[PDB]
Structure 1
Amino acid sequence: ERYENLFAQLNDRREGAFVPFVTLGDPGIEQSLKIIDTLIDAGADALELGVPFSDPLADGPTIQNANLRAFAAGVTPAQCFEMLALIREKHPTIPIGLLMYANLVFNNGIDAFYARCEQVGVDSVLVADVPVEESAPFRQAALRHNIAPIFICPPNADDDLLRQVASYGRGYTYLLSRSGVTGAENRGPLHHLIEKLKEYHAAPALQGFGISSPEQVSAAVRAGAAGAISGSAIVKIIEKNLASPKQMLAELRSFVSAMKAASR
């Protein structure tokens, strides 16, 4: 119950969660493991980790290039799970969530995918291209292996959607702050959804999409959200420093520390 304890701990501290995102193996297996440890060391409360996919159709240019860079290093899904096993052996308590595209979980059988997640220590799985209308098999397999099935609550969500997300989801509710794809390029009033999700005893909301400044995470928390996820702002730093790994890490720490502080 990694997310459960994390949120209870953060609540007692009257604090929000800061959850950075990166593509596993970007720009290399080793630099990525190093990037991930720096992320945690600078104050990350949890992690959202994507495994490289050929067609990331819910991602903008930054994350697209994150998958391309990973692909260029030859990072395969098998390698990702090996990386995840090690990250867990290194960090016992931090919630580990995976950003997944559908073919990758269905490829070797949906059930076998969630069993691998368990074996490795993954805490949750968000399948980016499976709406709640199609979640049944994924949801069921996740629960069967003690994996929290993450659902996306969009800004155009109706009440039936809110009620579905709140009953099926575990770990955290992914609250979109915008329409469109991932990108720190376009900046995202979510109070109503936040209150309604609370009413239905949904999983603590985590705002995602567009979150690039500490100001943004303080506002998410102020609006009632349990925390915020930031990906492109994070990955942009990796892109910015491909020729200087040491500066990458140094810059990664600076942003994450400034971002974590904004939730306190």
Structure 2
Amino acid sequence: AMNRIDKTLEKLKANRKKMLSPYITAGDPYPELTVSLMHQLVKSGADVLELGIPFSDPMAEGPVIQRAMERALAHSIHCDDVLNMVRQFRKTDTETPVILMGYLNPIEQYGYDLFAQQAVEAGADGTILVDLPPEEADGVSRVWQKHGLYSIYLCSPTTSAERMNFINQHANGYLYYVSLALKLPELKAQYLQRKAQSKLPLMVGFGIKTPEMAAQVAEFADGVIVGAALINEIIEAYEAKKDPLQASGALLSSMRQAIDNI
């Protein structure tokens, strides 16, 4: 089988088009908006969608994501609810790759094989498990492989030689680059250095707040991941009693254009 992620990245690579991937938390600010948001993001230029599974103990996330998860958990949105959203999305979008981002604990509670099976059946193409270090990922990788689910791994300026060895023979699709006062030339230097160690394309997954910054990064990077900025744009629209679809659409579309004109 050919994974949606590989199909999408091949087309982008052939056209010298940089990947743009928004993150949103499923269920935030309320469950009925999530699928509509997903479709809006695609309309506004998303190549890949990152959909977050809310978790009760996100000690690793920044304040913006933390609050998003709290809002989603107020509606009791869990793994099965997120898969139902993916199913609904897939009714009118079969091309766009969907990546599920979450913590390991709800999934292990759910059951690895059962989760992988249902996630693939629902129409998800891969997962980012934020608290699963590569050293611990062997059981998961084998189960994911069985169902054709892709594992998206994180790396950083300080990813060790052996960990990189762990990432290269189990990762598929692409890698997620994060640095943790970091400036653009340092980011560029460290990114290109890490990219040289990776078999896969490397997407920058932090610090992208504006169309300008998105373009500056896309100038050297394979792709860009936008999280906190979009979440903030959406919840600010909701709290101001304005259309969150308009707000998120305008933001992502301005990033799409900035990147493509860069």
TM-score by length of 1: 0.90
Instruction: Give the Cα–Cα distance (whole angstroms) in 2 for the partners of residues 245 and 100 of structure 1.
Output: 29
Determine the structure 2 residue equivalent to 1:241. 237
Partner of 2:41: 39
8 A Cα contact 1:217 1:227, kept in partner: no
* 1:192 aligns to 2:193 (yes or no): yes
Q: Is the 8 A contact 1:174 1:208 kept in 2?
A: yes
The alignment of Structure 1 onto Structure 2 pairs a total of residues equal to 252
- Aligned partner of 2:59 in structure 1 is 57
Aligned mates of 1:262, 1:165 — CA distance in 2: 31
Residue 252 of structure 2 corresponds to: 256
Decide whether the 8 Å contact of 2:21 with 2:46 is kept in 1: yes
Residue in structure 1 matching 2:208, options 183, 189, 211: 211
TM-score, length-scaled by structure 2: 0.91
Alpha-carbon deviation of 1:44? 0.5
Check conservation: 1:102, 1:130, Cα contact below 8 A. yes
The offset of 1:245, in angstroms, is 6.0
Verify the 8 A CA contact 1:118 1:145 in the aligned structure 2: yes
Q: Contact (CA 8 Å) 2:135, 2:163: kept in 1 or not?
A: no
- Partner Cα distance (2:12, 2:39) in 1: 21
The CA RMSD measured in Å over matched residues stands at 1.8
* Partner residue of 1:121 out of 120, 123, 128: 123
Q: 2: distance between equivalents of 1:203 and 1:6?
A: 14
Shift of 1:99: 0.6
CA distance in 2, matches of 1:67, 1:175: 22
Identity across the alignment (%): 28
Structure 2: where are the runs of 5+ without partners?
none
Q: Which residue of 2 aligns with 1:183?
A: none
Alignment of 1:49-198 (within 5 A): 49-176=51-178, 178-179=179-180, 189=189, 190-197=191-198
Equivalent position SS for 2:84: helix
Q: Secondary structure at the match of 1:260?
A: helix
1:26 aligns with: 28
Alignment CA distance shift 1:33-1:67 (3 Å): same
- Deviation of residue 217 (structure 1)? 2.7
In structure 1, stretches of 5+ residues that fail to align are 181-186
Report the Cα offset of residue 162 of structure 1.
Answer: 2.3
Is the contact made by 2:50 and 2:98 (CA closer than 8 Å) also made in structure 1? yes
Q: CA deviation at 1:195?
A: 2.0
